[PDB]
């Protein structure tokens, strides 16, 4: 009764007012590409990978942020939408380093995977690339900040989930950098979760460094015993050896987080 | 009646604190501020 | 009317534009400021919004939205939050220095405009955001605001109308992006000057998360006069949908660069010659003009012969009125370098928030630097055109659009110059 | 030119900084311009005040602003590094800021920047050994019709020629504080050689006011 009717590629869906365009699309099983958006963090709207055409609207809207209006037809696969994704991906990769073989993210990277699915297959960037200073934030999280795509997921997680305002951005424009400004360690019982939410290899697990590739691991869905919360976890193993621990989503227990002891 | 001379020469003697001294002098005239109801968003 | 221009002094609003009369309250009152302000305030917000709407006034900050409709977004019942008017005095567009003269030479016009404008929106206070480099202008404004408080013209019982209104001056700290309306609000709140997405719109969620309207200095400073002399008087100037008078800055290659007030829809050629002393070396020495500040695309001499200076006419010329900052370039200018320096400006001013402008404007800057030297191939021109179209329309704020339009203007009108420079570089380095 | 801080003996958390009692009075006036519960809006003016007292912002000054207004230091760090008017390393007594954007470039701001370097013997971005002047290029300063122009501390010096800016710098060395404004003959932004408008005496109160008021 409160629901309003919108259309995703011409197919009707009834959604609650305030539902974003991106959420209307996932009611029909369509996942809009994204980098800055995370459903458990506040909306940012800065990466622009979620741009999508609304029928009879000249300007593409950011699906992650734009509330859907009654009667809108969202064109998730139109030429305008595809061209918007190709351009944004091209901008994301212009300064990105050629690191995939030496980058722990390789093989489970959202930049790689969305470049394969939604971006062009070649480069026309003929300049030199940006290179960024690395930051030291403790023994657990390794930073290779030339890989950062300035999505601010880590900043929002630290502030909102971990309640620690030690991460921010410094500088401006193409020189804008994510970090602590001062030499500081991001040591919090939830700190290891910024490895998972970082879409790229900018933040990686120091203990896990270089030991395995994602395709060769066997995932064992299990339970954590480091405390009495009972966090749901995946135990990654390879050839009979435990390689790492990952969160397993459980809305009623740990959501998609784990503590540093569990990890 | 003279239209021949610049008449904005006072700012030739504004110092470092001119702007914030005026802001201090204006404080008495301001209406009471509204309140969000809490000390800050972190409270 | 068919011909617009030759505005008479009696019909000029900013009558102390050059600071040759007293700018303090006594001078402002003797020039007609603060006159029957109480009467205007007691006509009510609907009457004020009527005169602004009738005047046909459009935003003077660059975007040119119809002011009357925009200000009416605030004319709604209170929900509990306070309501604010934010006055944009950041004035960051290269070639634009019009708001600087209002603040320091006609400050009381701005203060009254805040009160009258703020009344129309039901605002409790006006925050005047002035760029940090305008220190002396900010102090002049601060002195003028003290005088109004001491005379009872603002504050408790403003002018005796029973309406309480405060005027605050907050200074910036050096950032062109803080002229963007939502980035301005974020700056007032004490964060980095990064624009917000819309929705929500400032009239719903603005400064401190309260209903707000952001208005340009010139837009607000003419509202008291429009309410006194009527919207019908203001609407009698300029073409239809392009009404009123406008402050013009003429810089670059003119004999007498100056700020002048002129009717809207004045021919561009007449404006440069009647007030700016003509193009250096003669009108035939003209190469190109940037009509509305660095964001607007350049137009070549041939287009400048008859183009009118108003919103609609300049859109027909594939550019825009913008802030009405006329930057003149003569035949001795290196046009490619001039535009390259503007892309370098946008590269230094990008807030870095969103991908297309953080990465793309920097990308365009590197290409332009090679285009200046001719160190490129012609196929890269269409590459640059396509890169600019990937920025435009895909960013959070219009700075991305403002960086892509100057590039398109260069490619649109001076492609042969780009190709000659590339051809010549290859010969010297073959 | 970096946006990361490294402790040094002259810039670290134990560097001495504190607002004077007079400056604490100004802070109260600043903090009272914003609604109760939104004190973080005072970061920009309070941080600027710290720079006006100290000449620049060591990390200790930033920490003090964060402490007073009760905001995280990172949020103050973000502001200090975003806005270009905040000096995060010491600058000279006179911060010479030459505009080099296109409108000033079209009117030969290059000759001004060249003249300053030749006179001062320094390069762009450098401070003199005596620490009296620091020279930098800046973007448009909102005085394009008065180009080429510079800003030194809080003052604009306009319509410059290489001769004009050498006299200005010589006055600064001599201790005299030169008057700001155009050095060509006009007083502000009016066209050179005589007004083309606003020559008639201005109308007084009530002129042209519509019926009903
Ligand atoms: C990068 C950028 C800089 C801007 N700078 C200014 C400015 O300095 N002054 C101004 O009035 N508007 C500026 N604007 C436009 C404002 O966002 C907004 O459109 C304007 O303040 C609205 O007021 P108005 O309707 O009276 O014109 C800027 C916009 C952008 C994208
Ligand atoms: S983050 Fe992804 S795309 Fe970037 S280097 Fe690592 S694996 Fe490659
Ligand atoms: S480090 Fe990772 S999560 Fe943080 S802003 Fe960069 S890409 Fe996003
Ligand atoms: S377009 Fe540029 S200035 Fe505007 S929000 Fe995006 S990055 Fe910031
Ligand atoms: S996912 Fe919407 S802009 Fe990043
Ligand atoms: S271009 Fe130098 S003041 Fe505007
Ligand atoms: K990661």
What torsion do the CA atoms of C306, C308, C313, C316 make, to the nearest 10 degrees?
A: 30
> Which of C16, C131, C338 comes nearest D102 by C-beta?
C338
**Cβ atoms within 10 A of the Cβ of C202, count?**
24
The vertex-A103 CA angle with A99 and A105, nearest 5°, equals 120
Long-range contacts from D18-25, C-beta under 8 angstroms, 24+ separation: D18/D64, D19/D49, D19/D50, D19/D53, D19/D64, D19/D68, D20/D53, D23/D49, D23/D53, D25/B24
| Number of Cβ atoms within 10 Å of the Cβ of D28 | 11
Q: Do C164 and B31 count as a contact with CB atoms less than 8 A apart?
A: yes
| Chain B: closest CA distance from residue C82 (Å) | 7
Q: Which residue of C104, C156, C166 is in closest CB contact with B8? A: C104
Cα–Cα nearest to C96, from C232, C312, C303, C290: C290
Q: How many residues appear in chain A?
A: 263
Residues 6+ apart with CB under 8 A from A7: A13, A71, A72, A73, A74
Choose the closest CB to D145 out of C132, C259, C277.
C259
Ligand having the closest approach to the CA of A205: 7
Tokens of residue D120, six digits: 């001062």
Beta carbon of A48 within 6 Å of any ligand 5 atom: yes
Shortest Cα distance, chain D CAs vs residue C430, angstroms? 32
In ligand 6, the atom with minimum distance to the C-alpha of D105 is 1
Which residue in A194, A158, A41 sits closest to A168, CA to CA?
A158
Q: Are D169 and D98 in contact (CB under 8 A)?
A: no
Resolution in A: 2.4
Chain C environment of D193 (Cβ under 8 Å): 256, 277
Q: From the CA of C350, give the closest atom in ligand 4.
A: 3
- From residue A228, alpha-carbon distances to A190, A222, A246, C230 in Å are 16, 14, 18, 74
Whether residue C158 contacts residue C36, with contact meaning beta carbons closer than 8 Å, is answered with no
Q: Do C156 and B31 touch (CB under 8 A)?
A: yes
Helix axes D73-82, D43-54, angle to 10 degrees: 70
**Ligand 3 pocket, CB under 6 A:** A 148-154, 178, 197-200, 202-203
Q: What is the helix (H) or strand (E) element at residue A115, kind and residue range?
A: helix A110-118
Q: Are C337 and C344 contacting, i.e. CB atoms less than 8 angstroms apart? A: no
Q: How far apart are CA D49 and CA D29, in angstroms?
A: 12
Best probe of the D interface among A134, A168, A169, by most D CBs < 10 A, is A168
Contact C14, C101 (CB under 8 A): yes
**Which ligand number lies closest to the CA of residue A114?**
2
Contact criterion met (CB < 8 Å) for C155 and B30: yes
Residue in D with minimal Cα distance to C9: D198
C chain contacts of residue D84, beta-carbon cutoff 8 Å: 173-175
Which residues on chain D are in Cβ contact (under 8 Å) with B36? 35-38
Local structure of D57: helix, strand or coil: coil
Dihedral sign, CA of C337, C252, D150, D2? negative
Specify the fold of C25-236. Rossmann fold (3.40.50)
Which of C4, C228, C262, D40 is closest to B41 using CA atoms? D40
Choose among C36, C277, C342: nearest Cβ to D213: C36
Beta strands D155-158 and D181-182 are: parallel
Is C307 in contact with C242 (CB distance < 8 Å)? no
Task: Using CA coordinates, name the residue in chain B closest to D70.
Answer: B40
CB contact under 8 A, B38 and D32: no
Residue D84 CA: distances (Å) to CA of A1, A48, D23, D56 = 53, 27, 23, 12
How near does any CA of chain C get to the CA of D207, in Å?
Answer: 7
Cβ–Cβ of A150/C358 closer than 8 Å? yes
Bridge partners of residue A54, in order along the sequence? A74
- Rounded Cα gap, residues C108 and C128, in angstroms: 13
D36 Cβ under 8 Å from any chain B Cβ? yes
Asked how this structure was determined, the answer is cryo-EM
Subunits in contact with chain A (3 or more CB pairs closer than 8 Å): C, D
Asked whether the beta carbons of C129 and C88 are under 8 A apart, the reply is yes
Contacts of C316 (CB under 8 A, 6+ apart): none
Among A76, A89, A86, which residue's Cα sits nearest to residue A26? A76
Mutate to test the pocket of ligand 2, among A89, A95, A109, A149 (most ligand atoms within 8 A of CB): A109
Decide if C86 contacts C214 (C-beta within 8 A). Answer: yes
Nearest CA to ligand 4 atom 1: C400
CB contact under 8 A, D6 and A167: no
**Rounded Cα distance, C405 and C382, in Å:** 14
Name which residue sits closest to atom 8 of ligand 3, judged by CA: A151
Looking at residue A69, the DSSP 8-state letter turns out to be: P
CA of A159 relative to ligand 7 center, distance in Å: 18
> Two tokens at B35?
């309140």
Q: How far is B25 from chain D (nearest CA, A)?
A: 8
Give every CB contact of residue C378 below 8 A, 6+ residues apart in sequence: C418, C419, C422
As a whole number of angstroms, the distance between CA A9 and CA A20 comes to 15
How far, in Å, is the centroid of ligand 1 from the Cα of C93?
Answer: 9
CA of C298 to the centre of ligand 6 (A): 17
- H or E element that contains C308: strand C308-309
Question: C265 — phi, psi (to 5°)?
Answer: 75, 15
A181/D76 Cα distance (integer angstroms): 10
Asked if A142 contacts A150 with a C-beta cutoff of 8 angstroms, the reply is no
Report whether C146 contacts C27 (CB < 8 A). Answer: no
Whether D68 has its CB under 8 Å from any CB of chain C: the answer is no
**Structure tokens belonging to residue D186:** 């006009």
Mark yes or no for CB contact B23/D35 under 8 Å.
no
Return the beta strands (E) in A88-212 as ranges.
141-143, 168-170, 177-179, 203-205
The C-alpha R_g of chain B, in whole angstroms, comes to 19
How far is the alpha carbon of D128 from chain B, nearest alpha carbon, in Å?
A: 23
- Cβ contact, residue pair D198, C18, below 8 Å: yes
Neighbours of ion ligand 7 (CB under 5 A): A 198
Distances (CA, A) of A85 to A53, A120, C111, C242: 11, 9, 47, 38
Q: Is D99 labelled as part of a ligand binding site?
A: yes
Cβ pairs bridging B and C (under 8 Å)? 59
Let me know: does C112 contact C33? Beta carbons within 8 Å.
yes
Q: Would you state the structure tokens that stand for residue A161, as one six-digit string?
A: 């989930």
D197 touches chain C (CB under 8 A): yes
> What is chain B's length?
43
Pocket around ligand 1 at a 6 A CB cut-off: C 59-63, 65, 88, 90-93, 176-177, 179-181, 214-216, 219, 397-399, 402
Contact in structure between C266 and C4 (CB atoms under 8 Å): yes
Give the span between the Cα atoms of C72 and C57, in whole angstroms.
13
Q: Nearest 5°: phi and psi at C286? A: -70, 140
**φ, ψ at C259 (rounded to 5°):** -105, 130
Helix (H/G/I), strand (E/B), else coil: C236: coil
């Amino acid at each position: 009764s409160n629901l309003i009717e919108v259309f995703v590629d011409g197919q009707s869906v009834m959604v609650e007012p305030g539902t974003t365009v991106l959420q209307a699309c996932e009611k029909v099983g369509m996942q809009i590409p994204r980098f800055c958006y995370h459903e458990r963090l506040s909306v940012a709207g800065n990466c622009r990978m979620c741009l999508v055409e609304i029928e009879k609207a000249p300007k593409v809207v950011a699906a992650c942020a734009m509330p859907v209006m009654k009667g809108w037809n969202i064109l998730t696969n139109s030429e305008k939408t595809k061209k918007a994704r190709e351009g944004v991906m091209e901008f994301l990769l212009a300064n990105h380093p050629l690191d995939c073989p030496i980058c722990d993210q390789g093989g489970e990277c959202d930049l790689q995977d969305q470049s394969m699915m939604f971006g062009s297959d070649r480069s026309r960037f003929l300049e030199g690339k940006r290179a960024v200073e690395d930051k030291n934030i403790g023994p657990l999280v390794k930073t290779i900040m030339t890989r950062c795509i300035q999505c601010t997921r880590c900043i929002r997680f630290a502030s909102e989930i971990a309640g620690v305002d030690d991460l921010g951005t410094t500088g401006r424009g193409n020189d804008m950098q994510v970090g602590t400004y001062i030499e500081k360690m991001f040591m919090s019982e939830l700190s290891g979760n910024i490895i998972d939410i970082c879409p790229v290899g900018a933040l990686t697990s120091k203990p896990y460094a270089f030991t395995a590739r994602p395709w060769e691991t066997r995932k064992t869905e299990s339970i954590d015993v480091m405390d009495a919360v009972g966090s749901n976890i995946v135990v990654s193993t390879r050839t009979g050896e435990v390689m790492r621990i990952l969160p397993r989503m459980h809305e009623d227990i740990n959501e998609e987080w784990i503590s540093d002891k569990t990890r | 009646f003279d239209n021949t001379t610049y008449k904005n020469l006072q700012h030739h003697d504004y110092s470092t604190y001119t702007f914030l001294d005026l802001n201090l002098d204006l404080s008495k005239f301001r209406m009471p501020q509204p309140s969000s109801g809490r000390e800050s968003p972190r409270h | 009317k068919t011909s617009f221009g030759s505005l008479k002094d009696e019909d000029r609003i900013f009558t102390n534009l050059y600071g040759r009369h007293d700018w303090r309250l006594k001078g402002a009152q003797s020039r007609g400021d603060w006159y029957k302000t109480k009467e205007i305030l007691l006509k009510g917000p609907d009457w004020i919004l009527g005169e602004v709407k009738t005047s046909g006034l459009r935003g003077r900050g660059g975007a040119g939205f119809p002011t009357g409709l925009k200000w009416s977004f605030m004319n709604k019942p209170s929900d509990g939050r306070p309501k604010y008017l934010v006055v944009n005095a950041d004035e960051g567009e290269p070639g634009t220095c019009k708001d600087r003269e209002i603040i320091r030479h006609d400050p009381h016009k701005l203060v009254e405009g805040c009160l009258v404008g703020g009344r129309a929106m039901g605002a409790r206070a006006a925050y005047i955001y002035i760029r940090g480099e305008f220190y002396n202008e900010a102090s002049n404004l601060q002195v003028a605001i003290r005088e109004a408080y001491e005379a009872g013209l603002i504050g408790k019982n403003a002018c005796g109308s029973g309406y309480d209104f405060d005027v605050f001056v907050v200074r910036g700290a050096g950032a062109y992006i803080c002229g963007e309306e939502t980035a301005l609000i974020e700056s007032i709140e004490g964060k980095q000057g990064k624009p917000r997405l819309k929705p929500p719109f400032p009239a719903d969620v603005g400064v401190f998360g309260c209903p707000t309207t952001v208005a340009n200095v010139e837009t607000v400073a003419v509202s008291p006069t429009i309410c006194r002399r009527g919207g019908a008087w203001f609407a009698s100037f300029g073409r239809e949908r392009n009404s009123g008078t406008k402050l013009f800055n003429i810089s670059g290659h003119v004999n007498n660069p100056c700020t002048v007030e002129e009717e809207m829809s004045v021919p561009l050629k007449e404006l440069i010659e009647k007030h700016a002393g003509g193009v250096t070396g003669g009108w035939d020495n003209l190469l190109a003009v940037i009509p509305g500040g660095s964001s607007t695309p350049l137009i070549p001499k041939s287009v400048c012969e008859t183009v009118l200076m108003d919103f609609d006419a300049l859109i027909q010329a594939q550019t825009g009125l913008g802030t009405a900052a006329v930057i003149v370039m003569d035949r001795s200018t290196d046009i490619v370098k001039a535009i390259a320096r503007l892309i370098e400006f946008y590269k230094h001013e990008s807030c870095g928030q969103c991908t297309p402008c953080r990465e793309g404007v920097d990308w365009m800057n590197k290409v332009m630097a090679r285009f200046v030297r001719g160190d490129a191939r012609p196929a890269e021109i269409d590459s640059l055109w396509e890169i600019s179209k990937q920025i435009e329309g895909h960013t959070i704020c219009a700075l991305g659009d403002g960086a892509a339009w100057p590039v398109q203007g260069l490619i649109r009108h001076f492609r042969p110059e780009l190709e000659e420079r590339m051809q010549q570089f290859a010969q010297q380095h073959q | 030119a970096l946006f990361v801080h490294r402790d040094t003996p002259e810039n670290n958390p134990e560097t001495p900084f504190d607002f004077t009692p007079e400056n604490y009075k100004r802070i109260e006036a600043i903090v009272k311009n914003y609604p109760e519960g939104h004190k973080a809006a005072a970061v920009l003016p309070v941080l600027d005040l710290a720079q006006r007292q100290n000449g620049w912002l060591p990390i200790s000054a930033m920490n003090k602003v964060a402490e007073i207004l009760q905001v995280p230091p990172m949020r103050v760090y973000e502001v200090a590094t975003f806005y270009t008017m905040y000096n995060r390393k010491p600058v000279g007594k006179y911060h010479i800021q030459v505009c080099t954007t296109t409108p000033c470039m079209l009117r030969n701001s290059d000759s001004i920047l060249e003249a300053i370097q030749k006179k001062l013997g320094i390069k762009v971005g450098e401070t003199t050994p005596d620490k009296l002047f620091t020279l930098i290029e800046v973007e448009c300063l909102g005085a394009c019709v008065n180009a080429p122009m510079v800003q030194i501390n809080d003052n604009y010096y306009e319509d410059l020629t290489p001769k004009d800016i050498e006299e200005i710098i010589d006055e600064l060395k001599a201790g005299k504080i030169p008057k700001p404004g155009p050095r060509s003959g006009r007083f502000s932004c009016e066209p050179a050689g005589g007004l083309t408008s606003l020559t008639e005496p201005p109308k007084g109160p009530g002129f042209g006011v519509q019926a009903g008021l």
